[PDB]
Amino acid sequence: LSDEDFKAVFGMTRSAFANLPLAKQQHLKKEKGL
């Protein structure tokens, strides 16, 4: 994912996402099927 598609898919920049607890990062990834 480009950073722009990252934001369209997860609703936040890659740097906000990297600040999330790891278990929630994984959760969000499963939820998007990515």
XYZ file of C-alpha atoms in Angstrom:
34
model
C 0.000 0.000 0.000
C 1.164 3.479 -0.842
C 0.803 5.807 2.130
C -2.236 7.430 0.466
C -4.007 4.082 0.058
C -2.937 3.286 3.632
C -4.941 6.217 4.871
C -7.972 5.335 2.666
C -7.911 1.762 4.050
C -7.086 2.296 7.774
C -8.428 5.850 8.359
C -5.125 7.156 9.666
C -1.572 7.782 8.495
C 0.994 4.999 8.730
C 2.678 6.877 11.583
C -0.522 7.091 13.702
C -1.049 3.364 12.982
C 2.485 2.494 14.102
C 1.682 4.187 17.434
C -1.122 1.716 18.165
C -0.712 -1.331 20.416
C 0.614 -4.231 18.345
C -2.454 -6.384 19.058
C -4.651 -3.649 17.630
C -2.413 -3.221 14.607
C -2.892 -6.926 13.891
C -6.621 -6.668 14.572
C -7.030 -3.799 12.187
C -5.066 -5.735 9.545
C -7.253 -8.869 9.930
C -10.382 -6.655 9.818
C -9.262 -5.141 6.447
C -8.017 -8.520 5.147
C -4.561 -6.974 4.577
